[PDB]
Amino acid sequence: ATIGRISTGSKSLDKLLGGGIETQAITEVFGEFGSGKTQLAHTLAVMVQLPPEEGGLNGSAMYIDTENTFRPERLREIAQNRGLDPDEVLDNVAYARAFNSNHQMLLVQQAEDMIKELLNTDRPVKLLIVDSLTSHFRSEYIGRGALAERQQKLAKHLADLHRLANLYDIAVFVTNQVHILAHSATLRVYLRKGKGGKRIARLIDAPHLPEGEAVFSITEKGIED
């Protein structure tokens, strides 16, 4: 099945990504607080709803929040400033708070129910966001021997997410706070602050995409160049 691409709002970042965030893939962004990772998540939750000539997939979004980062009024602002109705856009982002890592796993199973329900409608789910994907796992699995257990549980969670991406042709977008641990996202992107309020993006361990860094801004439209 054809891979779909969701624009980030930034031509620069889209170019680095090969056209946008991909369906049938998990894209992980990681960086410090304020590096742009959560702003990008909010922007994508709007962009996915646009028709494809505007960089979207005529879809809806689901957002799993682990550390209370979701801001409905930020979605509304981004929508309004892109010419969209803020309430309709907000209504197309299904939201759930994950209370702990086990609940987070259950939420992925519930996400599948909604994805199945909407799959063949005029507005299928096309984006699943997990913000700070590792936060509960790092809180709960800690101490002697916790590395193997935590990594096994994360690997399983990520396998579940890969399955949804592949089976239902959706983009999975995950964020993490910031060197020898294994990772299993399809594509990893490091974000950092740069000069002039810009953020800088770099692909990590991706020899299949060309060399470079993207530069973008955080604005009233979410993310843009």
Ligand X SMILES: O=C(O)C1Cc2ccccc2C1
- Is residue 24 near Na ion by the rule CB under 5 A? yes
Edge to edge, the sheet with strand 187-193 lists: 93-97, 60-65, 125-131, 171-177, 25-31, 187-193, 199-204, 213-219, 222-224
149 is in an annotated binding site: no
Q: Is 34 annotated as a binding residue?
A: yes
Please identify, using beta-carbon distances, which residue of 150 and 199 lies nearer to Ca ion: 199
Q: Is 118 in the site for ligand X (CB under 6 A)?
A: no
Contact 223, 13 (CB under 8 A): yes
**36 known ligand binder:** yes
- Per the CB < 8 A criterion, the answer to whether 61 and 129 are in contact is yes
Residue of 38, 60, 101, 132 interacting with Ca ion (CB under 5 A): 38
Which residue among 111, 164, 170, 191 contacts ligand X (CB under 6 A)? 111
The smaller minimum CB distance to ligand X, of residues 47 and 64, is found at 64
- The C-alpha atoms of residue 140 and residue 121 are separated, in whole angstroms, by 39
Is 39 a binding residue for Ca ion by CB under 5 A? The answer is yes
174, containing H or E segment: strand 171-177
- Among positive and negative, which fits the CA dihedral 206, 211, 217, 220? negative
111 contact, one of ligand X, Ca ion, Na ion, none, CB 5-8 Å limit per kind: ligand X
38 marked ligand binding residue: yes
Total number of residues binding Na ion (CB under 5 A)? 5
Residues forming a β-bridge with 6: 21
| CA angle (190 as vertex; 29, 62 as ends), nearest 5 | 10
Residue 39 interaction partner, one of Na ion, Ca ion, ligand X, none, beta carbon < 5-8 Å per kind: Ca ion
Contact flag: residue 96 with ligand X (CB under 6 A): yes
Provide the binding-site residues for Ca ion, judged by CB under 5 A.
Answer: 36-39
Bind-site residues: 31-38
* Annotated binding-site residue numbers for ATP: 31-38
